[PDB]
Design a protein around this nucleic acid. Structure first.
Lengths: 73, 201, 185, 272, 103, 180
RNA sequence: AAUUUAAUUUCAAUAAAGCAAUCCCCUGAAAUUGUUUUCACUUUCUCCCCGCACUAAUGUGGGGAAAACUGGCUUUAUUUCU
RNA sequence: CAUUUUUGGUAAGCAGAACUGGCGAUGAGGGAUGCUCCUAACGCUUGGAUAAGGUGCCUAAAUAUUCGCUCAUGAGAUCCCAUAAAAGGUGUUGGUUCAUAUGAACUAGCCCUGAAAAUGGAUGGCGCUAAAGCGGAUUACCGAUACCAAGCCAUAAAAAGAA
RNA sequence: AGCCAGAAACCAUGCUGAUUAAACAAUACUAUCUUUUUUGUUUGCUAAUGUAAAAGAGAAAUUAUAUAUGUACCGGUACAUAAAUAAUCCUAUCACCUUUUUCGUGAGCUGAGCUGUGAGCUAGGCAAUAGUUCUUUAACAACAAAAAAGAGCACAAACUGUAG
């Protein structure tokens, strides 16, 4: 989606200066596709203990969430 | 593949590619239910396809049509025949692959309860240009007199409406599950909750 | 070939449009007309406030240019039709026999009798929304009117086709009912 | 090379195989088609051919050579004992054709009906339709409701009354009759009200009607080609026979081209 | 549940065919995850086990095993050649195989 | 570096001369630039031209220089005019074509692709006589004139393809053509 | 996955300076055998005028300016910011 | 029998020559199939990497990349090889000469017409049109008993030998 | 590009066959037998074994593709929401017994109380173990024994001759 307006003849210094100015990567990170990509990147790099911790956390959540489902009726 | 049954929604899929992908899977090993098979696309025009089917009808036998070829009229059987062409069906290995394939026009309801997959490279959109003529296989079959069409049209509509009622119920259920999950995310211990958030909840 | 081809299509003041996803709909004093263009893959966009439509094509070829010019002409006809119905005035020619034009079914089916003295009936029903009236003013004249130029013309063509002889010379025998004048109300 | 003189082929290819029918009872291939405006009514009837007579009839026939003058004509007489309806059939449309959902039966049946199922009526204990003697009326109603809701074609199971005849046979012929006319509900009401009654041909048909006739032909066993197909007979001089066959044909196909006339069954064929 | 599998799934395809020609020395293996030569190259030296069920008790049991090892690809989509200690049966084509995590 | 869009046709400046003899006490030295896929091909084309123009075959001459010629500004896109002699099935023709590209070598590859695709002309049957950078206003081809407009910003409008890893055999739901 | 010292008209930034504006690294178009000389060519999300929304467009068709941000050259240092 | 040169004969998978290579006397891999075309000549085995040739499926490898051109109401698709021409075409695509972005004239690319036969019927079949078509290019992968290394067998030659 | 009418041609319809579909549906009656649980299936026979594919065999919008789905108005209008689509979600793995508090659902008694089952919280000290890998027997289906519980046809023979 994002675009930055620049003069047509520009080279690497000006491109670096402009990218640093406009902070487009932050806009990308905020963007939903970017956000899906960065979440996936974390998941890809996650260690064995980290993987267990995600399992354990989801297990705690299901216990609490099911208890809330009991609560609601 | 690595699963008991692939069900394929064959609407919008191009004949040759759809057949080839199914065939290699059958050869690899897989039971495959081809579903919704009148809405398959041929890349030729309606007249051109009618001409081809005319040539197919013309092919018979002088001797005795009791020992002649089969001019199957079902759109599902047309796909089946094409897949058979893409198998070595006079072998045992080919026959076993042939037996693994199941074909159905429209959505049979026991396999509509099941999940439907698609073959993403094989869509009409995917490998054909917009400005070039094509023809739907059911339309062609109707042109050459298969004529079991209106019943399927009614059945598909009734199934689809129920599917809409199902989809809204599913959406209701998913929204409620999201709501309870978000509420009970607060109740998780902070560090564990932070980790679960980090990895995308 | 070209990257960009455009057209800017003027719209009359009274037109009530509803053209989403190339399913064009125009409504006006004489009717609501619907006409898909979804086989044609182009970016018609509406402008309500300052009127007009802008049609643009990406990556045009002369085929595409033909499509743009065709669509704009077709759209203009749709506007023209709803604002004022298209009237095809058909004169009935005969050099010998009275040919009897009896309009039945509330201006929907013209009965024709006696082409070349045949003593028999040709009934020719109209298409949806195309009225067949006769002229009070000129005895041979027949009014074929409706919101679409294509259906009225097709209706007129059906009437010509229905009449015409098998095998008595085309140069010699001139009799039959023909489209004289294409107008609107 | 081509034949010197042309001459139409002997017999119709379209009625191969020339073989015995698998039932004595006529078989309706197809029934009358949709007419929602018409009220529900029966489409068919079985009756027994008794013989032929001749008639004298007065003729109108405008502009005929005979015209006003009277004619003598051959005619057939068919004794028609009233058929009895005993069952209701509910069929539903599928892309594989019409399929029966269920059948609903009357609250009693004839001995003559039961005789058709038994091969040895004399030496049996006759236990057919005895668990199915009765069920709750609620069950019957549910089935009728179910059939109205889902079925799109209604047939009535009818049977002949051979006990009203001089014939040796005592087994009834049992038969489906499609009902053609209005809504499935209106049809269902019509069949239910009619059910246990007896139907005269006058209840089904009107005089002067044109009617389609479905029957198996008179037998003759296995016959020669001359008899079966009417080919021109062999010359006075032959090595062998005179009802003996013509040439079968070409070397190519290297097989008998099936369109050739052949010795085999003649009569006992199904015909409309 | 009670069992933990500790292998990855595969499908024993044919032997290492070429059009109308047979090499029975090398077997072709489909590994469920893989779809590239480069990804397949990760798993390249791994030990492979074909386990199969039989009619009678052999050494008191109705389960038997053939061992092999993966060794090189057979295409850009990562379908891999495996050499076994004895040839696997054509009867077992399209059956399942176990790809161990060692060495 | 690249092997995913790469052209291996390069330009070589080649210099050679006649061997000194009693007749040819002072030789004539000849230079030309030649576009080829390799140095042997470049030399053989240079030798063919030496044969076609002069009386000098490989035997009669000696090579002074062959060197690949270097792109001044590869990041800059430039307007190349190219002048051809080519052979058809039934005749020989001259033609002058325009290509906007980064470099002359890309243009020659494009030219061979164009002649092959549109005219069925193989590389062997084409001879480039001059390829050079020319002013933008002097181009005759509409497709290049369209690029040379002030504001260029078309919608992309092409199919996804990804790569082998994420080239899935089957899918749960149907793809998104628009991509936005 | 790399790696060594060469070779071959190969850069790009870094931040301070300068230099020229249809001008310049360039690239055009012109007056046996060498020269060499002429004027043609950048940007703009800057400003103005006409057409005032006239556009494919978060603008625009035509006509003019402005600058040197952009690019280009000369420097002075700097290279794991790049 | 084949390429090339070639004589007779309307021509001929016809008759007759020349040079060379094949087959005969020869497996093997490709040419969809095929004594002869192409690749290539062979003990028994293991492994490699390639050739001719392929890589939509049958059928092993790419629904690869990359630029063109191509829609056909009987398209087209690997030498030999199983038809095809003169001649047309306001189908589309490039060129080139003229005139005043339009009007001419030519030109060759594709496509169309020219283009009819005998069981039912043959791009090998299914199929393929954002090609799996035609013309290129870019790689990777697959691909032989040919190629390299290793073992073993026999044959040939050579070493060397009468605690 | 988009269309229309239009032939003894074409495909259905019609009609004939359909052990051409190694096809099938509905109905009727019947064979100490069916159903649930346990143990077994290392004189031609008389206890009895077979699986081409268990390993989380997990996953039901939809027309689409030069835009979709809801919601609100009258098949159209307006307003939201998807757009790496399985690159996602679901989902396992807190053995034990024993102390404590809550919620779902089944069963027995005369709505409710209790028990069972499923899910959690709270407290304790309690298990595993074969000397290094060569299947991790973990899946489906069938059968034999043992208990417990459930409920007559056809052919022939004579007769026929619409048949041969």
């Amino acid at each position: 989606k994002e675009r930055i307006k620049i003069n047509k003849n520009c080279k690497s210094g000006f491109l670096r200066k402009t990218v640093n100015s406009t902070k487009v990567l932050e806009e990308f990170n905020n963007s939903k596709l970017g956000k899906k990509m960065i979440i996936k990147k974390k998941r890809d790099e996650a260690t064995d203990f980290e993987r267990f911790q995600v399992y354990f956390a989801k297990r705690e959540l299901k216990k609490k969430m099911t208890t809330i489902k009991n609560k609601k009726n | 593949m690595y699963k008991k049954e692939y069900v394929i929604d064959c609407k919008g899929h191009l004949l040759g590619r759809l057949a080839s992908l199914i065939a290699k899977e059958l050869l690899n090993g897989q039971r495959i239910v081809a579903v919704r098979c009148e809405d398959i696309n041929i890349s030729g025009s309606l007249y051109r396809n009618k001409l081809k089917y005319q040539e197919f009808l013309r092919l018979r036998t002088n001797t005795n049509p009791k020992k002649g070829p089969l001019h199957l009229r079902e759109p599902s059987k047309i796909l089946w025949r094409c897949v058979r062409g893409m198998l070595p069906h006079k072998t045992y290995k080919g026959q076993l692959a042939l037996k693994k394939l199941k074909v159905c026009v429209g959505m049979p309801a026991p396999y509509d309860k099941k999940k439907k997959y698609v073959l993403p490279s094989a869509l009409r959109a995917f490998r054909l240009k917009k400005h070039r003529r094509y023809c739907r296989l059911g339309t062609l079959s109707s042109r050459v007199g298969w004529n079991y069409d209106t019943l399927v049209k009614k059945n598909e509509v009734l199934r689809k409406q129920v599917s809409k009622a199902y989809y809204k119920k599913k959406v209701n259920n998913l929204n409620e599950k999201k709501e309870i999950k978000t509420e009970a995310l607060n109740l998780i211990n902070p560090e564990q909750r932070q980790v679960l958030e980090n990895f995308g909840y | 070939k070209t990257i960009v081809s455009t057209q800017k299509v003027l719209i009359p003041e009274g037109v009530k449009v509803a053209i989403n996803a190339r399913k064009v709909t125009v409504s006006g004093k004489y009717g609501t007309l619907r006409r898909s263009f979804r086989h044609l893959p182009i970016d018609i966009r509406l402008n309500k406030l300052k009127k007009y439509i802008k049609v643009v094509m990406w990556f045009g070829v002369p085929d595409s240019l033909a499509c743009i010019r065709t669509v704009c002409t077709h759209l203009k006809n749709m506007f023209t039709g709803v604002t004022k119905k298209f009237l095809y005035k058909m004169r009935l020619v005969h050099a010998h026999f009275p040919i009897n034009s009896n309009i039945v079914d509330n201006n929907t089916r013209i009965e024709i009798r006696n082409y070349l003295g045949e003593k028999s009936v040709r009934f020719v029903k109209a298409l949806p929304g195309v009225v067949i009236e006769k002229s009070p003013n000129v005895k041979d004249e027949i009014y074929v009117s409706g919101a679409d130029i294509e259906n009225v013309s097709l209706t007129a063509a059906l009437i010509h086709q229905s009449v015409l002889c098998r095998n008595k010379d085309i140069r010699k025998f001139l009799d039959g009912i023909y489209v004289s004048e294409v107008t609107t109300v | 090379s081509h034949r010197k003189f042309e001459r139409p082929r002997h017999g119709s290819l379209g009625f191969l195989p020339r073989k015995r029918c698998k039932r004595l009872r006529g078989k309706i291939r197809s029934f009358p088609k949709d007419d929602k405006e018409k009220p529900p009514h029966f489409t068919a009837f079985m009756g027994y051919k008794a013989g032929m007579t001749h008639i004298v009839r007065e003729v109108d026939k405008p502009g005929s050579k005979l015209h006003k003058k009277e004619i003598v004509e051959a005619c057939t007489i068919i004794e028609c004992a009233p058929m009895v309806v005993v069952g209701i059939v509910g069929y539903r449309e599928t892309p594989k054709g019409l399929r029966i959902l269920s059948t609903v039966w009357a609250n009693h049946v004839s001995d003559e009906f039961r005789r058709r199922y038994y091969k040895n009526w004399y030496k049996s204990e006759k236990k057919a339709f005895t668990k199915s003697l009765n069920v709750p009326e609620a069950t019957k109603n549910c089935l009728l409701k179910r059939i109205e809701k889902y079925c799109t074609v209604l047939r009535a199971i009818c049977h002949t009354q051979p006990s009203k005849t001089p014939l040796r046979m005592k087994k009834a012929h049992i038969m489906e009759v499609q009902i053609n006319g209005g809504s499935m509900k209106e049809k269902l009401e019509f069949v239910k009200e009619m059910l246990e009654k007896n139907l005269p041909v006058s209840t089904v048909f009107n005089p002067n009607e044109m009617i389609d006739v479905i029957s198996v032909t008179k037998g003759h066993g296995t016959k020669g080609v001359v008899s079966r197909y009417g080919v021109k007979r062999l010359p006075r001089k032959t090595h062998r026979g005179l009802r003996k066959v013509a040439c079968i044909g070409a070397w190519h196909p290297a097989r008998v081209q099936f369109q050739i006339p052949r010795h085999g069954q003649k009569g006992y064929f199904h015909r409309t | 549940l009670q069992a933990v599998r500790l292998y990855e799934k595969g499908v024993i395809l044919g032997y290492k065919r070429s059009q109308r020609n047979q090499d029975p020395n090398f077997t072709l293996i489909s590994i469920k995850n893989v779809n590239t030569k480069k990804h397949a190259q990760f798993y390249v030296g791994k030990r492979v086990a074909y386990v199969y069920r039989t009619t009678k008790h052999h050494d008191g049991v109705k389960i038997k095993c053939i061992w092999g090892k993966v060794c090189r690809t057979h295409g850009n989509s990562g379908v891999i050649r495996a050499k076994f200690k004895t040839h696997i049966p054509p009867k077992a084509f399209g059956d399942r195989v176990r790809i161990l995590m060692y060495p | 570096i690249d092997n995913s869009l790469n052209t291996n046709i390069h330009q070589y400046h080649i210099v050679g001369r006649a061997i000194p003899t009693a007749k040819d006490k002072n030789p004539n030295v000849y230079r030309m630039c030649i576009f080829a896929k390799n140095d042997t091909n470049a030399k053989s084309r240079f030798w063919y031209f030496m044969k076609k123009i002069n009386k000098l075959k490989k035997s009669n001459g000696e090579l002074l220089a062959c060197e690949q010629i270097k792109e001044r500004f590869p990041l800059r896109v430039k307007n190349y005019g190219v002048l051809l002699r080519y052979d058809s099935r039934t005749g020989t023709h001259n033609m002058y074509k325009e290509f906007r590209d980064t470099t002359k070598e890309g243009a020659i590859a494009q030219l061979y692709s164009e002649m092959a695709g549109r005219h069925r002309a193989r590389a062997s049957s084409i001879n480039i006589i001059r390829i050079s950078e020319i002013s933008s206003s002097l181009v005759r081809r509409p497709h290049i004139k369209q690029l040379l407009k002030r504001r260029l910003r078309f919608p992309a409008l092409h199919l996804p393809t990804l790569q082998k890893e994420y080239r899935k055999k089957f899918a749960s739901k149907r793809p998104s053509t628009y991509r936005m």
